[PDB]
Write a protein that binds this ligand. Sequence first.
Ligand SMILES: [Cl-]
Lengths: 213, 202
Amino acid sequence: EIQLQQSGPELVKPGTSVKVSCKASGYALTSYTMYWVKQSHGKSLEWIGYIDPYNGGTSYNQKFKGKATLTVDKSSSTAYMHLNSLTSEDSAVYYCAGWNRYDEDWGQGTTLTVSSAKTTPPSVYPLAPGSTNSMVTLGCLVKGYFPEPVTVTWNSGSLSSGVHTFPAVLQSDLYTLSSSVTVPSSTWPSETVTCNVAHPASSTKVDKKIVPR
Amino acid sequence: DIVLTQSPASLAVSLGQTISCRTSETIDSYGNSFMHWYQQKPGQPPKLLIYRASNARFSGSGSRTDFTLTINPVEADDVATYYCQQTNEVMYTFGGGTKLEIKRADAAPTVSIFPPSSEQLTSGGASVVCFLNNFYPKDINVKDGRQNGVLNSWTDQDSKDSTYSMSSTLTLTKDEYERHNSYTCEATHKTSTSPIVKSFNR
Ligand SMILES: [Cl-]
């Protein structure tokens, strides 16, 4: 009965304030209570606070009293979470959820990065193997981008389940990740295999055909 | 306050083959108090499973102070971290979460080595990549005959075949890369008594 769409990822400087949005759609939307969760990279979920869109009731985690301000905009069916006095400890994934007795939906998460570093596009480098078997594993390397998230598809998503995208790793203040696609060697290099890299932070989308040599 | 505590932090069962959550404040003391159990698959939002109120594949058990999620049977899709949560007008709170692992027969890693792109070489750098893919268990070690500038990255247990895959990278300057010739990536896994190795000349 309800579906939720959070705003895009974000890079902001310490000591400013963001507002992230959650656009609801569905039936009987004031019947759902909106709330917000923080998930730090590889950490557990912590509740931020709630807002009852029908009556305006709100209740916050003590730790975010003062920090976070939840509002809803019944007109545009949008919940907001405003965050002040931002620091590096705040950067994490922020979910928005809605629920009642009958069902419950979460949003897709919003990656927020607090840093005074500037955005850095990825370096997308193809990985072709050397010189035997029906399967051939290709790859693609995205080198030194900031911040994270980054979206990596193969052939615009036409290749899946043959994929292994590896969690980016922080080395020298930057992220780098690799992803392996495996296909029949019947198919490659006859059929053109392409790496797709979206870095929404640096508003970047690059395709790199893998080529045989 | 309200403290949610769940045992165990880490779990590991095989296909075909319970998690407890204990509140410090009972659900029954508030008029509209709720307990939830969530499944979080990796790189996904958490999804609601079961709920309990005050006054099929998965089931909730226990007393009004212990909401017990019980998965039976375990599919390979059930690989995730599981969270319990308590609801009332004063606060929401979540448990620590419990990581679920699938038990599978040990598997040979499929190793493939890769040389620097010409695009990275014209940039002035050179990176050597080794995918070890689809190997059980997670335990694995990797290494002209350096250990500096290496970067590794594991994957979570696969949801289809209950497997792990690892990526490693050895990185040099343009000029330092040609100072050597044979580059061999050595894969020390448990099951293969021989250390699976692959190399390239140029
Ligand atoms: Cl560092």
